[PDB]
Design a protein around this ligand. Sequence first.
Ligand SMILES: Cc1cc2nc3c(=O)[nH]c(=O)nc-3n(C[C@H](O)[C@H](O)[C@H](O)COP(=O)(O)O)c2cc1C
Ligand SMILES: Cc1cc2nc3c(=O)[nH]c(=O)nc-3n(C[C@H](O)[C@H](O)[C@H](O)COP(=O)(O)O)c2cc1C
Ligand SMILES: COc1ccc2[nH]cc(CCNC(C)=O)c2c1
Ligand SMILES: COc1ccc2[nH]cc(CCNC(C)=O)c2c1
Ligand SMILES: [Zn+2]
Ligand SMILES: [Zn+2]
Lengths: 229, 229
Amino acid sequence: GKKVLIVYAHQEPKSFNGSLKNVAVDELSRQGCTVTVSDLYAMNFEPRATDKDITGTLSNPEVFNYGVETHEAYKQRSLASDITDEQKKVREADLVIFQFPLYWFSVPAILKGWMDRVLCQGFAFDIPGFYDSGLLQGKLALLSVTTGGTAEMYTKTGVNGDSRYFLWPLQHGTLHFCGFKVLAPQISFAPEIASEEERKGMVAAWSQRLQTIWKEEPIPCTAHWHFGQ
Amino acid sequence: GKKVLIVYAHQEPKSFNGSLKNVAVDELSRQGCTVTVSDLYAMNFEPRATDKDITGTLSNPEVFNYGVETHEAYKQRSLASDITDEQKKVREADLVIFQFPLYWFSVPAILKGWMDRVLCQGFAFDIPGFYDSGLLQGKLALLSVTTGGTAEMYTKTGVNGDSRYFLWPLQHGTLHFCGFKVLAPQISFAPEIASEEERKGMVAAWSQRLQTIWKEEPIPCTAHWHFGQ
Ligand SMILES: Cc1cc2nc3c(=O)[nH]c(=O)nc-3n(C[C@H](O)[C@H](O)[C@H](O)COP(=O)(O)O)c2cc1C
Ligand SMILES: Cc1cc2nc3c(=O)[nH]c(=O)nc-3n(C[C@H](O)[C@H](O)[C@H](O)COP(=O)(O)O)c2cc1C
Ligand SMILES: COc1ccc2[nH]cc(CCNC(C)=O)c2c1
Ligand SMILES: COc1ccc2[nH]cc(CCNC(C)=O)c2c1
Ligand SMILES: [Zn+2]
Ligand SMILES: [Zn+2]
């Protein structure tokens, strides 16, 4: 049996991102997987890392240290319920798919906020207690990203540089750091500029890939994979 | 004369980030510069990119496209006032300093939200009108980042890889894309693990650098600068 969490960050259900999230639910549900979706915009998910993330009394109310406070709150079961609800979904998942449009070579702020607030010390990693000593080892993660720029722009000699260059903070700095095994990213280039048939083709390629997702090996999440030849 | 905008993202005024922001205000004010600070957490700055960012009739209310709607809203002067207030500060600034702790090899979500919402099409870039032709051409930008990890961890052979690797989405994908000339980053490594004297030393090195900031040349914001080869 297999459980999947899809963390989805798009405002418009009729969007191309919406279509990719819906075909992932459809395909994984067809396989008999247990599927949960965190639709961040529909949840009005809080992105800001603030003292409202800890309930009750702070370890040090005079000098607020977000990392220290959330690490202690996690251990004391005093984190805000929106964070713990997401942590329960991650803890139970075997695969976490992130579905989002690329915003400034990174995730939209609402999804950056999910990463900042949900992946706290004690839950996803400890200090020390990261990368392969991370706490989400055994779990798979996958970035399903859509872009405005064409594939050609995202080549080593292209204006944007290779698409792997922007994946480093997300795949390595975040997912690998927490102990996830990183599956190859799904990059859907320039859907708004594509034809209706080309968009249908991109959606079908993602659905087809999901049919055999449990047979994939993760990428070697190294500097060489992201920046080398 | 010169005008500086400091976009600051830290919850705690007593923090090391707070000390760096304050010494920048002190030094630039001593030089006779005009200084403005956007303290994002104190402003409870909205990070989410939503339809609340447009006040008028949407160009397409049936299928919401944030990029299209904000581009049109910028041209019509129908953007939310919190965005327009930040744009006025950026338009007037000769130098924009971003002061923040590194969160997941990137900016905290509240600051990612400032980038997503403030740097809209029509204001910060256009198509064509990006990279060396970006609309913020002639302006300088500088990232002043603090980290948990030591300098040694942020080297090519270190666990985190070189610090320049994580700068790519911010310096190139965002600042250079909008036409800014990027000054060399100020990276204050591991202040929480440092001694009180070492922290004082990092604050003084930043103040000393600011004394001659107007004499600096920008970096060559290229893939070669960030990744080598
Ligand atoms: C705030 C913002 C920032 C964006 N930044 C990028 C970027 O860095 N690179 C890129 O290729 N496209 C960028 N885009 C374009 C989106 O990635 C693109 O519109 C989206 O992936 C299309 O998918 P959708 O039709 O489902 O929205 C940006 C769009 C917005 C609104
Ligand atoms: C949500 C979160 C994510 C962080 N991610 C990183 C990271 O990617 N790399 C790093 O070296 N430190 C990371 N840190 C540690 C902070 O960068 C560090 O505590 C801060 O820069 C210290 O400055 P301050 O004392 O003024 O807060 C993170 C902290 C938090 C709370
Ligand atoms: C809440 O603190 C966080 C969150 C995510 C993180 N990624 C990297 C670090 C730096 C940790 N430094 C050492 C020496 O262990 C980190 C800290
Ligand atoms: C670094 O590339 C960026 C940064 C911000 C952006 N906002 C919107 C787009 C592209 C939107 N699609 C087209 C081709 O019009 C975009 C690209
Ligand atoms: Zn890695
Ligand atoms: Zn560049």
